[PDB]
Design a protein around this ligand. Structure first.
Ligand SMILES: [Ca+2]
Lengths: 206, 224
């Protein structure tokens, strides 16, 4: 009825990685700018055209997609899929993003922008947290009003590749002009590979 | 060749309906089942249902029961998917996907290119272009980050350049977010030398063609 796969798996070039799907299981590769493609069907069958570095297996309720001699080009979303005959329905796993670690760790630089004078004239305020020059391309963003977590008015982009091949991300906190003046300070907290980088901004004082 | 061509991107108000087409060529149309599968921007693949083009019988997924209608036209080799009473959670790329009837096991061999359906209360609206005043990126490295917030626009897309295309080094323009208001917002940032602030002028050129909005916004350094 439900297929469970981890949201994130990583490995270095030339190494072997596995992606587990726990519930016949079919595997699809999703590369950007292309249709989903079948890599493995019926647990173990590799269709003609699929490189031999991909293989599938199943023991009990646990299906596994393996990639040997991992390539940077294998970076993609991988989806497991079943036919639930009791409900006569197709069931998908949540997807696994495969990261291929092709350069060393680089910590993000975080820059927090206050709302502009122009936005405040329009009776609005947005805080912009710019996150740049990080690898790998995964961060968690948490916003703070003084010390307390902000649970609403937050929009965050999925990391995008910069022209230098490191990653960037952006986060936005929407608030009222009074809220910007009510609190002493607001904070953007960024978590990357266990490490936290925090920046704070306050209304300009002259 | 086997080819599946889907209809163009669509913009819809909540409560409305959408009809997406899937034109099949290069095989005997009635001999293969057609599925529909969606993917929301922040989610995985989601099965919607199946149609057998020979006879037109359908089986839909539980969550779309009473909301989705699948039809086919044999003479044009086209499969249709209609989704009614649309909500913001229906914002997704919709795929048609072919399935070989041999075996009984549902799995997909050939897909359409996908159709983006955006469900939003918003009508056409130009962005406000707010400056993101230069702030220290690295004081040792002597870099500053500055940008423009391209806020509250509909629909996609928007174009951003810097200094009319003269500045490309250290420019990063982010993908848009679709906010809870149903309006898009994006940012464009530039990493510049700190020493260029106050001598070199920085202007973001914002173009939103659907709303005839062209804005050239100078990003001035912070000063009391
Ligand atoms: Ca089949």
């Amino acid at each position: 009825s439900v297929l469970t796969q981890p949201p994130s798996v990583s490995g270095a070039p030339g190494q072997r990685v596995t992606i587990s799907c726990t519930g016949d299981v079919h595997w699809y590769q999703l590369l950007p700018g292309a249709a989903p493609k079948l890599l493995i069907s019926h647990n173990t069958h590799r269709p003609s055209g699929v490189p031999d570095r991909f293989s599938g297996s199943k023991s009990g309720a646990s299906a596994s997609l393996a990639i040997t001699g991992l390539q940077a080009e294998d970076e993609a979303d991988y989806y497991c899929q079943s036919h639930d005959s009791s409900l006569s329905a197709v069931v998908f796993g949540g997807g696994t993003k495969l990261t291929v670690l092709s350069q060393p760790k680089a910590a993000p630089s975080v820059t927090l922008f206050p709302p502009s004078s122009e936005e405040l004239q329009a009776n609005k305020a947005t805080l912009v947290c710019l996150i740049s020059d990080f690898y790998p391309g995964a961060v968690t963003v948490a916003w703070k009003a003084d010390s307390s977590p902000v649970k609403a008015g937050v929009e965050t982009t999925t990391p995008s590749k910069q022209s230098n091949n490191k990653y960037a991300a952006s986060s936005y906190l929407s608030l009222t002009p009074e809220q910007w003046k009510s609190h002493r300070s607001y904070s953007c907290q960024v978590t990357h590979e266990g490490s936290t980088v925090e920046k704070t901004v306050a209304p300009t004082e002259c | 060749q086997v080819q599946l061509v889907q209809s163009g991107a669509e913009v819809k108000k909540p409560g409305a309906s959408v009809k997406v087409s899937c034109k099949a060529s290069g095989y005997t149309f009635t001999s293969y089942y057609m599925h529909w599968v969606r993917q929301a921007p922040g989610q995985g693949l989601e099965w919607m249902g199946i149609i057998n083009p020979s006879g037109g019988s359908t089986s839909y997924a539980q969550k779309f029961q009473g909301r989705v209608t699948m039809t086919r036209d044999t003479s044009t080799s086209t499969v249709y998917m209609e989704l009614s009473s649309l909500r913001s959670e229906d914002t997704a790329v919709y795929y048609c996907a072919r399935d070989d009837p041999g075996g009984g096991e549902y799995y997909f061999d050939y897909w359409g290119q996908g159709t983006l359906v955006t469900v939003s209360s918003a009508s056409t609206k130009g962005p406000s272009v707010f400056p993101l005043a230069p702030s220290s990126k690295s004081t040792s490295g002597g870099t500053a980050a500055l940008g423009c917030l391209v806020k509250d626009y509909f629909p996609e897309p928007v174009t951003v350049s810097w200094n009319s295309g003269a500045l490309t080094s250290g420019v990063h323009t982010f993908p848009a977010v679709l906010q809870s208001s149903g309006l898009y917002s994006l940012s464009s940032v530039v990493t510049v030398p700190s020493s260029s602030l106050g001598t070199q002028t920085y202007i973001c050129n914002v173009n939103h063609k659907p709303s005839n909005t062209k804005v050239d916004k100078k990003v001035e350094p912070k000063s009391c």
